[PDB]
Amino acid sequence: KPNYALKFTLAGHTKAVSSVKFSPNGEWLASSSADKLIKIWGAYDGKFEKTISGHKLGISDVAWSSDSNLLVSASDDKTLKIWDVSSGKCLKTLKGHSNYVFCCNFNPQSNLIVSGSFDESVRIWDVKTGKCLKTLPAHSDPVSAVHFNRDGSLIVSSSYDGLCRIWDTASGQCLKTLIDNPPVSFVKFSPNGKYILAATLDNTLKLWDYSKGKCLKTYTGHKNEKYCIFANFSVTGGKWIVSGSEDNLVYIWNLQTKEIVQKLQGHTDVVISTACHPTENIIASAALENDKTIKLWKSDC
Numbered sequence: 001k002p003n004y005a006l007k008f009t010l011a012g013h014t015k016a017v018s019s020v021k022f023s024p025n026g027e028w029l030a031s032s033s034a035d036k037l038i039k040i041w042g043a044y045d046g047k048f049e050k051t052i053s054g055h056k057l058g059i060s061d062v063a064w065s066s067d068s069n070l071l072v073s074a075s076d077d078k079t080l081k082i083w084d085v086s087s088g089k090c091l092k093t094l095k096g097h098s099n100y101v102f103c104c105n106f107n108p109q110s111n112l113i114v115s116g117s118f119d120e121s122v123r124i125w126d127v128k129t130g131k132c133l134k135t136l137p138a139h140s141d142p143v144s145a146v147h148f149n150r151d152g153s154l155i156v157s158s159s160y161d162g163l164c165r166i167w168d169t170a171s172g173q174c175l176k177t178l179i180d181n182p183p184v185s186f187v188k189f190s191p192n193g194k195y196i197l198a199a200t201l202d203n204t205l206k207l208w209d210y211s212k213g214k215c216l217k218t219y220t221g222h223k224n225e226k227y228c229i230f231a232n233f234s235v236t237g238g239k240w241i242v243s244g245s246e247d248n249l250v251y252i253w254n255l256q257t258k259e260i261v262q263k264l265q266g267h268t269d270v271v272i273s274t275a276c277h278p279t280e281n282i283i284a285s286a287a288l289e290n291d292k293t294i295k296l297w298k299s300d301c
């Protein structure tokens with residue numbers, strides 16, 4: 001079992017935090033908030049680095065380019081913005097969605113951005129020009145998550161409509177639909193690209209072989225019936241699953257046995273987002289508006 005212990009609490013956001021993400025080079029943590037701001041923090045000591053501003057309404061998600069030089073943010077103002085992290089300047093505003101943008105990601109190559117929106121569509125965008133390349137009629141309800149696989153050739157999307165879908169990046173064609181149908185609040189590809197991890201608002205995480213349409217594992221015991229809470233694979237030490245929870249705790253499961261191996265206590269509101277450091281056994285966690293803080297935790301395995 002891991003032994004994550006609190007090392008830093010990071011205050012500064014003035015509304016609920018929505019997303020935390022470590023930069024791929026391990027140096028930074030980015031946070032987004034309903035307060036319309038992105039904040040950059042040192043990944044190792046939690047020292048505040050800078051505030052990035054420009055969105056007109058709150059932000060649901062942020063994501064890093066693979067070279068850690070760009071961020072993209074998804075906002076209720078119906079746009080995404082591409083930011084140069086070093087200068088804090090908005091490089092591009094991605095316009096096209098007709099309602100709130102809820103989720104976003106770069107592909108590994110980082111020449112594309114994928115977004116999902118309340119408008120039920122998935123859009124694929126050219127990073128260099130900011131132009132929308134494809135609009136996928138992906139779902140019949142808000143899109144809660146979008147993620148590229150390890151080589152960028154596939155996209156997975158989830159939605160409140162109860163579906164997960166796998167898309168061919170180049171053609172935009174839907175290659176697979178996984179379908180009771182509780183709302184899907186989060187999905188991402190596994191590190192080895194063969195599985196997807198999906199959160200449903202039945203307080204359950206499920207590890208699916210999407211090619212076979214078989215559910216290999218389920219992770220339960222946490223509380224998730226309302227919010228789109230990020231889940232993570234922890235790949236630096238022991239193989240874990242990490243998720244926030246609506247009972248204010250961080251949950252950590254053994255990937256193989258599905259046993260809860262740790263619960264991290266300290267937040268005073270829903271833990272809406274967690275993130276796992278790329279090389280060290282470090283977790284970042286973030287909570288809603290009774291709390292508004294980010295916590296950094298460290299384990300020996």
Ligand SMILES: CNC(=O)c1nc(NS(=O)(=O)c2cc(Br)cc(Cl)c2O)cn1C1CCCC1
Pocket residue numbers: 190191192193194195207216217233234235238239240241255256
């Ligand atoms: C000894 N290996 C396994 O037990 C195993 N690895 C995977 N691959 S994975 O999900 O992508 C993955 C997850 C984590 Br957390 C870290 C890494 Cl590095 C990684 O590759 C799946 N499993 C089993 C088979 C179904 C569930 C457990």
